Each structure stands twice: as C-alpha cells, then as structure tokens.
Amino acid sequence: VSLMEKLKWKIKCIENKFLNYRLTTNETVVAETEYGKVKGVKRLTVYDDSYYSFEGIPYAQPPVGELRFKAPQRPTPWAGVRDCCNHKDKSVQVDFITGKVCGSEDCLYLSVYTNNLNPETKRPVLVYIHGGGFIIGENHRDMYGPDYFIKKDVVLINIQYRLGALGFLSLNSEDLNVPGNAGLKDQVMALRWIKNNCANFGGNPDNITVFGESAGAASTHYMMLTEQTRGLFHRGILMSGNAICPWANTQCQHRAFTLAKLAGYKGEDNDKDVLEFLMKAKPQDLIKLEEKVLTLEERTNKVMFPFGPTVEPYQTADCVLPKHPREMVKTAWGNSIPTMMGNTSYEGLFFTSILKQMPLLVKELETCVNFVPSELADAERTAPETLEMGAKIKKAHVTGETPTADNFMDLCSHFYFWFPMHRLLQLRFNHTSGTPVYLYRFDFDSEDLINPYRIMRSGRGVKGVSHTDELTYFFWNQLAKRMPKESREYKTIERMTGIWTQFATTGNPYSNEIEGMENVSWDPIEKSDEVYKCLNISDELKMIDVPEMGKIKQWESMFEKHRDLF
Ligand SMILES: *B(O)c1ccc(OCc2ccccc2F)c(Cl)c1
C-alpha cells in the first residue's frame, strides 16, 4: 500500500469518464429479451471502430436482504424499455489499488456487445467470465472493454457474479439454505439467460463459447463440470486456471463463524446465529474483514482465499458442486466439447508483489514442504515423507545453493497453474468421448501496452510474461493506447482475438488467415502423448513441446507412492 497509486489511478479515472463520454454516440437501439426490452447504444473505439453496447442487463434478482448468500432467483420483468446505456456497479470488493471497499450487492448483471445488431448470419457467441480470485473483478469496460473483439463478427458477453463472502459463504446446516457457491450459481443463471436470449442480439444459440482467465478459467471449468449447465455451450477456453488448481476451491464452512467474530458477533459457534448476524452486517464491513479470516496455519498450508468454490455439504435445488472437482471430472458433460487451455511463460511472476511484502517466503524453498500438495502433506509439514516430497519440488526449481525470489516464482508457476493443468488433462483422458484439447503458451512480452494488473503485481520494470499479461491483447482497458498497425503489440491483438474467434466458430483454433500461422500445425493433445505440444505465442507463432514438461513430471513424481490421489 503505497498511497498514491490512488492518485493517478483517480486521475486516470477522471480521464476515463471524459473519454467514455467522447466515445459514446447518440445511436440508441432497442432489443428484445425474455424479460422485456432493453435500450443499448453504439460506442466508439480508439481504433476508429464501433459497436453496439448493452450494459446492466439483469439476469437475476438483486441478491440483497434475505437473498444474501442464497442461490440466485430469476429477475422480475418489465413492460416498457429498460435503460442499458450505462454499466451497473461491480460486486462488493476491496479495490486492489485504492485499498478501499467499492461496489454494490446489486451486481448480478451482464453486458452484450456486437458490431452488427442485425447480422445476415447467426454469429458465434463468446462469453467471458472474469478472474480475480473470486474476490475482485468486474465487467466494466475500463478493465474489460470489447473494443478489440468487436473487430470480429461475433457477439461478446461479459458477465458479473458475486464475489468473496457474499458469493461463497457456506454453512453446514441444511435448514439455512446456504450450501455455498452462490457466485457460481450466479454464473449458471447467466449462462441460461445467454442461451435463451443471445439470438435477439444476432447470436447463434447453438454456437456458444465460454472462456475465462484465472478465477474465470476455473469458473469456465466449473461450468463444464456441473450437470446444471449441460449443453448450454459448445466450446470452452481455460486461460491460466481450472477447477482443480489448489486456489480454486476450499472447504470454508468453519470460516463463517470466524468472519462473524471479526465483525463483532457476540454469541456461540452456531450456524443459525452466525447467519443471522452476517445477514445484518454492512456488506463493506464483511468484505474488508475478509483478508483477516485465514489463520496463520491456513496461509502456511497455501490456502489462498478464505471463501471460494466449495464442495457443498448437502444437495439443494441449485447445487453446482456436489463432489470434489476431481470426482466431477469423471462424469463431466464438458469433457466432450472442444476445449483449449493454456498458460503464460512466467505465470509466477505475478507473486512479485506478495514476495516484496513477505521476503521470508523465499525461505520456504529451503525444504519446499509448504508447497507439497495439501492432500499429500501432514498438517505440521514435519513428516519425513513430506520432507521427501518437498525435496522433489526443490530439485525442480532451486537452481543455486540457496533459493532466490525467481526460484520461488518459477515454483509458483507450477504449483498454481501448470501442475493442476497436467492433473486435469490426465484425469479427463480417462473420461472423454474423445473431443480435442488444444494447448497454447502465451509468451509475448511487451511493456509498451499494459493492463492494470501490472500495477498490482508491481510488474512495471519486471520482464517475463506474468499471469494476466495476456489480457492486454484481448480487452481494452483504461491504461491502453492506440498502437501502430505495424507494432508487435497490435499484431498480437489481431492474432489473439483471431485465434479465439476461430476456435469459438469451429472448435479448431487454426486458420491460415491469421498472420504467423502459415506453418502452424496445431494438433490437440492425445492420451498416448508423453509430451504435451502447444502453440507458443511470441513474436513468432511456433509449435513446441511444452518447456515446462520436465518440471511437470517432477511434480507428478510426488505421487509415485500415492497414485490414487493424482
Ligand atoms: B486469478 O483469478 C488469481 C488471482 C489471485 C491469485 O493469487 C492471490 C493474489 C491476490 C492479490 C495479488 C496477488 C496475488 F497473487 C491467483 Cl493464484 C489467481
């Protein structure tokens, strides 16, 4: 927290509103939805393109009052024309830059964008679910502008969903109807809306692609796992994340009481009494205290967030996760739709900011016991077997006699992203109709065009392709600028929106109409593959064996004596 990030961030924000106004037009339009008419408006881009914009389309009732912590309910429709010419608020969260809580409980909205409201053909529909660890994020165009994607003839939809304790509180007591995963059930309801309404915006309801980055990738994967969404969409893209990443789920049923007690609850550890208190609390109080819920023991054992997706303790009407995700892969409908997955070439660089805060973290690599997968480790991480397992990790990532910060961040690349990807691929290969999985590796490094996460990760001046660096080439954000058509950055925008649009359309990401792809033979992964091939996306596009594969096998070797748990 170095105070006046908040300044230029406030004055990049005084600019973003003038610019937003200047890029607005007077061309309003009305579209039909199953809940009533919505009025949208055309907007301009800095590349002199334009698109129709519908923001603040409700897909559920505002989950306020008695609806807090509950599964979403269908919204209440209207006669007349609803105003969708302005965005709604984001879900209640801590602003990662201003450090202050922002947003509203009234956040269950989606936005629809297209360059042509009346196309002559049904268009592929792309649905983006944002990341942010299930605790931050939004569909506001200052972070996720559609301006690049609307160069292509697609319909792009950006959803919101409840975050933090408001989205992911879970209580054991069956009588209370807070089984957990409200935020994922939000996504399910948004997907149902999209399926039933995208046609009114020129979309093909039989050709929908869901994609997401980070927590949005885990979300996309959860939407492919749950039987609640069966057949609602037809392709998935998992960008740096999936549902069996260790940060992507947690059993948090005991932490509601902790949150209550942090906020001033007086009384006993009792689900009913705890729920009653949490129902009454100011939303901004609960979200601000969320950062204090995890114990030192939990943090040591690499629990990243106190509330997130959870295995629900009993089954309700709108249950999304009845079993551990690894179990849900066994029968997942989404196993049998075309899928693309990928990661960046230095994911772990993202934890730069965390390291600067707590330098002593680097000494975790002395034994690496803390990064042994939790299901394998003992609670004190002092067991000799845990020490042995840790030594396998240590050999994969410690390059000198003493671990460095770079070693730590390389390790994080695998703990948080590459190893979970491996486990998923192998698990799914036992339960798939045979539909292809394509892998990419995003390896394009530039500091000439950036996005706000680079601030948060303090990555200005740091080199390598961190977690979230690829977002810059998919979405407009308030820190972006018009780049020369010949720049490597602009060409990367064209390649990324191009490949994603090609995959959305056909279920195959290859096209010789994409510059650089003229010699790419991009083949999906097979069960019989001992080495993964990926499209490596840099200044050149090249098919390579995943450079991370060696370290991936090294992680896998921790499961030599526990193969059932892999
Ligand atoms: B993806 O949604 C994602 C977000 C955050 C992660 O780590 C926690 C974190 C939070 C804030 C700053 C830096 C961080 F690393 C992860 Cl692993 C994934």
XYZ file of C-alpha atoms and ligand atoms in Angstrom:
584
model
C 0.000 0.000 0.000
C 1.952 2.997 -1.345
C -0.746 5.685 -1.154
C -0.823 7.469 -4.452
C -1.209 4.784 -6.873
C -4.677 6.055 -5.796
C -3.940 9.488 -7.327
C -3.065 8.889 -10.949
C -5.496 5.964 -10.641
C -8.073 8.604 -9.589
C -6.900 10.930 -12.379
C -6.711 8.087 -14.922
C -10.270 7.672 -13.714
C -11.231 11.308 -14.204
C -9.940 10.858 -17.748
C -11.669 7.537 -18.412
C -15.050 9.211 -17.856
C -14.412 12.076 -20.292
C -13.072 9.580 -22.807
C -16.048 7.286 -22.187
C -18.367 10.217 -22.883
C -16.492 11.179 -26.052
C -16.639 7.602 -27.267
C -20.393 7.447 -26.735
C -22.813 8.087 -29.598
C -26.435 9.175 -29.940
C -27.366 5.999 -31.756
C -29.573 4.200 -29.260
C -31.258 0.938 -30.128
C -33.787 -1.433 -28.558
C -33.513 -5.219 -28.418
C -35.916 -7.859 -27.131
C -35.251 -10.108 -24.142
C -37.383 -12.733 -22.425
C -37.825 -10.259 -19.534
C -38.524 -7.147 -21.602
C -36.991 -4.605 -23.963
C -33.522 -3.202 -23.356
C -32.137 0.037 -24.794
C -28.486 -0.052 -25.763
C -26.180 2.410 -27.502
C -23.366 2.433 -30.031
C -19.902 3.291 -28.734
C -16.601 4.088 -30.467
C -13.088 2.708 -30.050
C -9.716 4.398 -30.276
C -9.089 2.318 -33.396
C -12.000 4.113 -35.091
C -14.260 1.074 -34.859
C -17.729 0.952 -33.346
C -20.013 -1.495 -31.587
C -23.481 -1.723 -30.020
C -23.387 -1.777 -26.229
C -25.944 -3.220 -23.817
C -24.772 -2.976 -20.186
C -26.621 -3.677 -16.947
C -28.843 -6.435 -18.283
C -30.121 -8.152 -15.129
C -30.033 -11.947 -15.244
C -31.218 -12.439 -11.656
C -32.889 -10.581 -8.778
C -30.552 -8.277 -6.858
C -29.319 -10.721 -4.211
C -29.937 -8.302 -1.340
C -31.662 -8.616 2.027
C -32.993 -12.119 2.588
C -31.440 -13.171 -0.706
C -27.907 -12.525 0.607
C -25.820 -15.744 0.478
C -28.700 -17.520 -1.321
C -28.868 -19.046 -4.790
C -29.942 -16.504 -7.414
C -33.586 -16.205 -8.417
C -34.897 -15.157 -11.820
C -35.282 -11.397 -12.273
C -38.609 -9.586 -12.365
C -39.526 -8.497 -15.882
C -40.864 -5.167 -17.072
C -43.103 -3.644 -19.704
C -41.597 -0.666 -21.487
C -37.895 -0.204 -22.164
C -35.141 -0.767 -19.611
C -32.114 1.555 -19.773
C -28.927 -0.377 -20.610
C -26.854 2.579 -21.820
C -24.754 2.636 -18.652
C -22.942 -0.015 -16.651
C -24.066 -1.145 -13.186
C -21.830 -1.472 -10.147
C -19.309 -4.249 -9.592
C -19.745 -6.806 -6.811
C -18.627 -5.667 -3.334
C -14.837 -5.916 -3.147
C -11.615 -4.337 -1.973
C -10.187 -2.091 -4.658
C -6.729 -3.564 -5.208
C -5.346 -0.089 -5.898
C -7.234 2.287 -3.601
C -7.346 -0.289 -0.794
C -10.912 0.847 -0.107
C -14.065 -1.222 -0.487
C -16.155 -0.440 -3.543
C -19.100 -1.917 -5.406
C -22.629 -2.926 -4.538
C -24.552 -6.034 -3.558
C -26.666 -5.177 -6.612
C -24.251 -6.603 -9.166
C -25.909 -9.501 -10.980
C -25.709 -8.085 -14.491
C -24.263 -8.921 -17.884
C -23.235 -6.848 -20.896
C -23.697 -7.641 -24.569
C -21.535 -6.268 -27.394
C -21.656 -6.649 -31.194
C -20.585 -4.595 -34.228
C -23.776 -5.513 -36.039
C -27.108 -5.895 -34.293
C -28.748 -7.313 -37.405
C -26.149 -9.603 -38.967
C -27.015 -11.583 -42.072
C -25.891 -14.767 -40.380
C -26.151 -16.159 -36.842
C -22.872 -15.281 -35.086
C -20.666 -17.212 -32.682
C -21.274 -16.076 -29.103
C -18.318 -15.633 -26.742
C -18.992 -15.405 -23.023
C -16.221 -14.044 -20.847
C -16.025 -14.836 -17.135
C -13.528 -12.538 -15.373
C -10.862 -13.622 -12.903
C -9.785 -12.029 -9.648
C -9.511 -14.999 -7.278
C -13.310 -14.978 -6.791
C -12.789 -11.833 -4.684
C -12.311 -8.985 -7.194
C -13.229 -8.147 -10.776
C -15.999 -6.698 -12.897
C -17.430 -6.405 -16.404
C -16.729 -2.657 -16.562
C -15.121 -1.557 -19.823
C -12.295 0.266 -18.023
C -10.869 -3.208 -17.423
C -12.636 -5.446 -19.948
C -13.506 -3.370 -22.983
C -14.852 -5.281 -26.017
C -13.082 -2.917 -28.419
C -10.692 -5.486 -29.902
C -13.128 -8.388 -30.169
C -15.772 -6.312 -31.947
C -13.408 -6.083 -34.934
C -14.559 -9.692 -35.498
C -18.096 -10.741 -36.394
C -19.009 -12.203 -33.022
C -21.254 -11.440 -30.076
C -19.267 -10.861 -26.873
C -20.892 -11.046 -23.443
C -19.181 -10.157 -20.165
C -20.861 -11.370 -17.009
C -20.604 -10.421 -13.345
C -21.201 -12.761 -10.406
C -20.996 -12.441 -6.614
C -17.534 -12.307 -5.058
C -15.992 -13.019 -1.667
C -18.055 -13.970 1.363
C -21.202 -12.634 -0.345
C -20.645 -15.096 -3.173
C -19.158 -18.045 -1.368
C -20.270 -18.299 2.250
C -21.118 -21.955 3.068
C -22.960 -23.288 6.110
C -23.366 -26.938 7.091
C -26.877 -26.513 8.493
C -29.339 -27.857 5.917
C -32.153 -25.725 7.371
C -30.420 -22.470 6.398
C -30.151 -22.919 2.604
C -26.627 -21.501 2.380
C -24.856 -24.570 0.983
C -22.226 -22.432 -0.771
C -21.205 -21.444 -4.309
C -23.772 -18.692 -4.757
C -21.349 -16.939 -7.118
C -21.051 -19.996 -9.357
C -24.840 -20.390 -9.325
C -24.921 -16.766 -10.498
C -22.786 -17.845 -13.481
C -25.149 -20.742 -14.218
C -28.124 -18.397 -14.287
C -26.195 -16.028 -16.571
C -25.396 -18.905 -18.936
C -29.076 -19.874 -19.065
C -30.014 -16.266 -19.907
C -27.389 -16.148 -22.645
C -28.574 -19.406 -24.181
C -32.170 -18.143 -24.225
C -31.535 -14.585 -25.337
C -28.374 -14.309 -27.434
C -30.419 -14.809 -30.622
C -32.030 -11.387 -30.043
C -28.602 -9.782 -30.456
C -27.653 -11.748 -33.567
C -26.058 -14.660 -31.758
C -26.187 -18.349 -32.626
C -27.529 -20.168 -29.549
C -26.106 -23.397 -30.933
C -22.569 -21.953 -31.101
C -21.564 -20.537 -27.716
C -18.047 -20.394 -26.285
C -17.302 -19.740 -22.648
C -13.835 -18.509 -21.711
C -12.162 -17.011 -18.688
C -8.799 -16.163 -17.173
C -7.567 -17.096 -13.673
C -10.632 -17.488 -11.416
C -12.577 -17.049 -14.644
C -10.809 -20.098 -16.079
C -11.624 -22.141 -13.007
C -15.193 -20.784 -13.385
C -15.377 -21.819 -17.025
C -14.134 -25.257 -15.987
C -16.783 -25.456 -13.224
C -19.409 -24.561 -15.829
C -18.127 -27.524 -17.891
C -18.150 -29.857 -14.853
C -21.576 -29.278 -13.339
C -24.640 -31.043 -14.673
C -26.533 -27.756 -14.165
C -25.181 -26.366 -17.446
C -25.258 -29.497 -19.643
C -25.380 -28.459 -23.318
C -25.699 -24.711 -22.621
C -22.500 -24.101 -24.580
C -20.264 -25.738 -27.149
C -16.615 -24.759 -26.640
C -14.507 -23.874 -23.593
C -11.262 -21.932 -23.217
C -9.362 -22.192 -19.930
C -6.860 -19.324 -19.598
C -4.355 -19.950 -16.781
C -6.654 -21.910 -14.475
C -9.024 -24.790 -13.900
C -11.160 -26.199 -11.096
C -8.527 -28.426 -9.557
C -5.998 -25.643 -9.048
C -5.343 -25.591 -5.301
C -6.582 -21.989 -5.083
C -9.813 -22.778 -6.968
C -11.684 -24.440 -4.122
C -11.719 -24.665 -0.346
C -13.801 -26.198 2.447
C -14.744 -22.941 4.179
C -17.761 -23.967 6.241
C -15.925 -23.265 9.509
C -14.794 -19.806 8.434
C -18.209 -18.104 8.555
C -18.030 -18.090 12.360
C -14.544 -16.559 12.155
C -15.819 -13.848 9.809
C -18.726 -13.124 12.144
C -16.414 -12.816 15.158
C -14.112 -10.428 13.265
C -17.157 -8.223 12.576
C -18.334 -8.090 16.192
C -20.625 -11.080 16.534
C -21.291 -11.922 20.202
C -22.575 -15.427 20.858
C -21.745 -19.065 20.163
C -20.423 -21.003 17.165
C -23.834 -21.831 15.783
C -24.752 -21.737 12.065
C -28.155 -20.170 12.599
C -26.911 -17.458 14.918
C -23.871 -16.794 12.751
C -26.042 -16.495 9.612
C -28.430 -14.084 11.340
C -25.502 -11.823 12.249
C -23.935 -11.973 8.782
C -27.304 -11.147 7.164
C -27.417 -7.856 9.079
C -23.831 -6.719 8.688
C -22.836 -3.905 6.345
C -21.626 -5.570 3.156
C -18.475 -3.418 3.053
C -17.574 -4.492 6.622
C -17.609 -8.205 5.796
C -15.612 -7.774 2.588
C -12.961 -5.574 4.235
C -12.510 -8.056 7.096
C -12.223 -10.950 4.671
C -8.447 -10.547 4.421
C -8.138 -11.441 8.128
C -10.187 -14.645 8.143
C -7.460 -17.159 7.221
C -5.337 -18.446 10.103
C -1.538 -18.459 10.009
C -1.789 -22.244 9.726
C -4.046 -21.983 6.667
C -1.775 -19.444 4.991
C 1.246 -21.637 5.663
C -0.604 -24.557 4.083
C -1.195 -22.379 0.995
C -4.901 -21.704 1.450
C -5.163 -18.611 -0.733
C -8.687 -17.341 -0.069
C -10.960 -17.792 2.911
C -14.144 -18.105 0.805
C -14.370 -19.669 -2.627
C -15.969 -22.528 -4.555
C -16.640 -25.429 -2.170
C -17.936 -28.988 -2.092
C -21.473 -28.272 -0.854
C -22.282 -30.129 2.392
C -25.779 -31.141 1.259
C -27.648 -31.120 -2.058
C -30.142 -28.360 -2.843
C -32.169 -27.443 -5.897
C -29.430 -25.345 -7.493
C -26.373 -27.327 -6.340
C -23.339 -26.830 -8.609
C -20.612 -28.804 -6.812
C -21.858 -31.984 -5.054
C -18.376 -33.584 -5.085
C -14.700 -32.614 -5.240
C -13.873 -31.307 -8.738
C -11.541 -34.271 -9.394
C -14.574 -36.520 -8.848
C -16.761 -34.335 -11.035
C -14.310 -34.702 -13.956
C -15.238 -38.415 -14.064
C -18.680 -37.739 -15.497
C -18.478 -34.138 -16.716
C -20.503 -33.288 -19.814
C -17.937 -30.629 -20.680
C -15.305 -33.300 -21.253
C -16.923 -33.851 -24.616
C -16.866 -30.351 -26.063
C -13.880 -28.827 -27.912
C -11.524 -27.309 -25.355
C -8.493 -25.046 -25.407
C -6.221 -24.495 -22.409
C -3.064 -22.507 -21.842
C -0.794 -20.565 -19.522
C 1.749 -17.776 -19.875
C 5.504 -18.404 -19.980
C 6.253 -16.986 -16.481
C 2.969 -17.242 -14.582
C 4.616 -16.994 -11.176
C 5.991 -13.505 -11.802
C 2.517 -12.471 -10.579
C 3.591 -13.141 -6.985
C 6.287 -10.454 -7.120
C 4.148 -8.124 -5.001
C 3.464 -10.819 -2.365
C 7.216 -11.546 -2.177
C 8.105 -7.894 -1.666
C 5.685 -7.867 1.262
C 6.899 -11.118 2.838
C 10.505 -11.821 1.743
C 10.754 -14.723 4.213
C 8.554 -16.681 1.807
C 11.621 -17.400 -0.284
C 12.971 -19.489 2.591
C 10.014 -21.840 2.151
C 12.139 -23.257 -0.667
C 14.817 -24.469 1.740
C 12.710 -27.657 2.059
C 9.662 -26.785 -0.077
C 7.470 -28.699 2.375
C 4.810 -25.974 2.272
C 4.266 -26.431 -1.450
C 3.682 -30.180 -1.264
C 0.049 -30.710 -2.429
C -2.043 -30.487 0.746
C -3.728 -33.859 0.281
C -0.235 -35.465 0.458
C 1.269 -33.396 3.254
C 0.950 -33.685 7.001
C -0.501 -30.728 8.886
C 2.757 -29.597 10.523
C 4.662 -30.459 7.341
C 7.313 -32.090 9.524
C 6.751 -35.706 8.462
C 9.767 -37.393 6.827
C 7.627 -38.307 3.803
C 6.634 -34.647 3.461
C 10.302 -33.706 3.598
C 10.981 -36.231 0.818
C 8.165 -34.958 -1.345
C 9.353 -31.403 -0.770
C 12.832 -32.404 -1.926
C 11.403 -33.433 -5.305
C 9.904 -29.934 -5.771
C 13.103 -28.300 -4.535
C 15.120 -30.093 -7.237
C 12.727 -28.836 -9.908
C 13.059 -25.151 -9.055
C 16.018 -24.260 -6.807
C 18.955 -23.500 -9.094
C 21.611 -22.468 -6.532
C 22.713 -23.478 -3.027
C 20.139 -21.032 -1.708
C 16.681 -20.314 -3.131
C 16.012 -16.988 -4.843
C 12.867 -14.959 -5.493
C 12.921 -16.114 -9.116
C 13.082 -19.715 -7.932
C 10.081 -19.028 -5.758
C 8.114 -17.535 -8.648
C 9.045 -20.329 -11.030
C 7.802 -22.802 -8.404
C 4.530 -20.815 -8.148
C 4.036 -21.192 -11.907
C 3.780 -24.945 -11.417
C 2.032 -25.152 -8.038
C -0.724 -22.792 -9.055
C -1.103 -23.428 -12.805
C 0.974 -25.982 -14.732
C 0.735 -28.977 -12.385
C -3.076 -28.634 -11.940
C -3.364 -28.424 -15.735
C -1.418 -31.689 -16.029
C -3.564 -33.456 -13.454
C -6.721 -32.293 -15.232
C -5.547 -33.412 -18.690
C -4.618 -36.853 -17.412
C -7.789 -37.232 -15.337
C -10.013 -36.158 -18.227
C -8.283 -38.532 -20.645
C -9.966 -41.366 -18.727
C -13.469 -39.928 -19.206
C -13.776 -38.215 -22.598
C -15.803 -39.021 -25.705
C -12.584 -38.085 -27.480
C -13.085 -34.420 -28.310
C -9.808 -32.483 -28.768
C -7.894 -30.371 -26.243
C -5.615 -27.717 -27.755
C -2.810 -26.123 -25.680
C -1.300 -22.659 -26.047
C 1.620 -21.000 -24.255
C 1.406 -17.229 -24.157
C 4.968 -15.978 -24.495
C 4.592 -12.455 -25.883
C 6.440 -9.920 -23.751
C 5.868 -6.183 -24.002
C 5.893 -3.215 -21.674
C 4.623 -0.823 -24.378
C 0.997 -1.800 -23.824
C -0.199 -2.956 -20.372
C -3.224 -3.550 -18.138
C -3.951 -2.512 -14.530
C -2.881 -5.874 -13.003
C 0.688 -4.943 -13.905
C 0.372 -2.163 -11.323
C -0.941 -4.520 -8.619
C 1.797 -7.069 -9.320
C 4.282 -4.163 -9.459
C 5.414 -5.540 -12.798
C 6.483 -2.267 -14.404
C 10.208 -2.819 -14.920
C 9.967 -6.574 -14.488
C 10.421 -8.788 -17.547
C 8.744 -12.068 -18.419
C 5.137 -12.964 -19.235
C 3.235 -12.968 -15.956
C -0.232 -14.216 -15.039
C -2.760 -11.749 -16.607
C -0.307 -10.198 -19.090
C -2.222 -11.746 -21.968
C -5.451 -9.878 -21.053
C -3.883 -6.813 -22.694
C -4.237 -8.435 -26.116
C -7.879 -9.444 -25.681
C -9.536 -6.495 -23.919
C -9.284 -2.717 -23.895
C -8.512 -1.143 -20.522
C -8.163 2.424 -19.255
C -4.357 2.235 -19.388
C -4.250 1.140 -23.032
C -3.489 3.293 -26.061
C -3.884 3.123 -29.827
C -0.895 1.210 -31.162
C 0.606 1.437 -34.683
C -0.893 -1.149 -37.048
C 2.623 -2.463 -37.662
C 3.602 -2.805 -33.987
C 4.197 -6.230 -32.463
C 1.526 -5.355 -29.878
C -1.129 -4.596 -32.467
C -0.259 -7.742 -34.409
C -0.634 -9.746 -31.187
C -4.090 -8.277 -30.609
C -5.048 -9.448 -34.077
C -3.615 -12.906 -33.532
C -5.223 -13.467 -30.137
C -8.730 -12.219 -30.978
C -8.298 -14.064 -34.268
C -7.400 -17.470 -32.794
C -10.055 -17.147 -30.090
C -12.702 -16.225 -32.680
C -11.627 -19.083 -34.967
C -11.849 -21.578 -32.106
C -15.215 -20.174 -30.988
C -16.526 -20.622 -34.516
C -15.191 -24.053 -35.477
C -13.841 -25.787 -32.370
C -10.405 -25.701 -34.037
C -8.096 -22.759 -33.315
C -6.106 -22.951 -36.567
C -6.562 -20.631 -39.521
C -4.176 -19.699 -42.323
C -5.971 -16.331 -42.393
C -4.085 -15.479 -39.220
C -0.686 -13.903 -39.891
C 2.130 -16.032 -38.492
C 0.074 -19.220 -38.567
C 1.052 -20.090 -42.158
C 3.178 -23.023 -40.866
C 1.442 -23.900 -37.620
C 0.320 -27.496 -37.382
C -1.613 -27.132 -34.148
C -2.659 -30.557 -33.008
C -4.612 -31.365 -29.864
C -3.243 -33.487 -27.022
C -3.791 -37.266 -27.011
C -3.993 -39.758 -24.136
C -0.960 -41.531 -25.590
C 1.119 -38.341 -25.510
C 4.028 -38.437 -23.063
C 4.980 -34.890 -24.005
C 2.445 -32.077 -24.497
C 2.636 -29.974 -27.666
C 1.487 -26.346 -27.507
C 1.270 -23.331 -29.756
C 3.884 -20.954 -28.368
C 2.723 -17.406 -28.956
C 5.551 -14.905 -29.099
C 6.693 -12.546 -31.830
C 6.616 -15.748 -33.862
C 3.930 -18.433 -33.614
C 5.617 -21.834 -33.218
C 4.515 -25.343 -32.245
C 6.807 -26.627 -29.498
C 6.874 -29.216 -26.777
C 5.838 -27.584 -23.521
C 9.138 -26.410 -21.934
C 7.512 -26.900 -18.521
C 7.039 -30.638 -19.119
C 10.188 -31.729 -17.278
C 9.224 -29.908 -14.103
C 5.644 -31.166 -14.510
C 6.888 -34.794 -14.388
C 8.985 -33.889 -11.348
C 5.848 -32.694 -9.517
C 3.989 -35.799 -10.652
C 6.715 -37.949 -9.057
C 5.483 -36.912 -5.600
C 2.522 -39.219 -6.306
C 4.657 -42.311 -7.030
C 3.573 -43.891 -3.721
C 0.068 -42.380 -3.814
C -1.078 -42.826 -7.390
C -4.766 -42.973 -6.475
C -4.571 -39.340 -5.314
C -3.027 -37.977 -8.528
B -6.919 -15.450 -10.657
O -8.258 -15.005 -10.501
C -5.872 -15.355 -9.362
C -5.865 -14.214 -8.560
C -5.010 -14.148 -7.497
C -4.154 -15.212 -7.216
O -3.244 -15.096 -6.064
C -3.735 -14.260 -4.978
C -3.274 -12.794 -5.166
C -4.092 -11.797 -4.812
C -3.681 -10.465 -4.988
C -2.413 -10.178 -5.532
C -1.588 -11.178 -5.888
C -1.986 -12.489 -5.718
F -1.152 -13.479 -6.075
C -4.187 -16.365 -8.043
Cl -3.148 -17.785 -7.792
C -5.033 -16.433 -9.094
